[PDB]
Write a structure and sequence with these properties.
Keywords: Cytoplasm, Heme, Iron, Metal-binding, Muscle protein, Oxidoreductase, Oxygen transport, Phosphoprotein, Transport. The protein has helices at residues 4-17, 21-35, 52-57, 59-77, 83-95, 101-118, 125-148. It has 153 residues and is an all-alpha fold. The radius of gyration is 15 Å and the shape is globular. It binds protoporphyrin IX containing FE.
Length: 153
């Protein structure tokens, strides 16, 4: 459970994300696929984007990153009270896309990397710690939902 002050730090940096959701999403996904190349294989439509410039020019990838960050932002704004928002995401990621928790850890690492890169003055130790706790909670709760659906990834 996060403190109210921790949630405030999470939401303060998230408001900075929201000044450019598309660009943050692009940077996060480019970092994810570069750092952990096994992850790109779950996106059949993005496999032909072989350079960073091609990834940045893809409208499809850019739109997908807005879809991802919008869902995550809406979860974060519930400050842990997120069952209703989390269930559909667990349902598709467990039973359709088959995304292991380890890959959600990789994406979380990429989120934190991009937030520090773009917002160092608003992403010091206490804010990093708060965002880490928020993402850890998201991953803990989605893992429990994965298992409810029969998925042990
Ligand atoms: C912060 C974590 C993530 C969030 C919030 C998120 C959110 C979403 C949302 C909202 C969709 C669209 C609706 C749906 O199918 O559920 C989606 C689709 C998808 N996600 Fe995720 N996602 C996350 C992490 C991942 C990771 C780590 C992978 C795999 C490496 C992944 C692979 C996919 C795939 C393959 C699709 C469907 C894409 C398509 O067919 O167009 N997701 N995700």
């Amino acid at each position: 459970v996060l403190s109210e002050g921790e949630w405030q730090l999470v939401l303060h940096v998230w408001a900075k994300v929201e000044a450019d959701v598309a660009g943050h999403g692009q940077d996060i996904h480019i970092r994810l696929y570069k750092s952990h190349p096994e992850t790109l294989e779950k996106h059949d439509r993005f496999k032909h984007l072989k350079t960073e410039a091609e990834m940045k020019a893809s409208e499809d990838l850019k739109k997908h990153g807005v879809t991802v960050l919008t869902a995550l932002g809406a979860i974060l704004k519930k400050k842990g009270h997120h069952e209703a928002e989390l269930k559909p995401l667990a349902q598709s990621h467990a039973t359709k896309h088959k995304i292991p928790i380890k890959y959600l850890e990789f994406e979380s690492e990429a989120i934190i990397h991009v937030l520090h890169s773009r917002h160092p003055g608003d992403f010091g130790a206490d804010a990093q710690g708060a965002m880490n706790k928020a993402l850890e909670l998201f991953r803990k709760d989605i893992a429990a939902k994965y298992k409810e659906l029969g998925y042990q990834g």
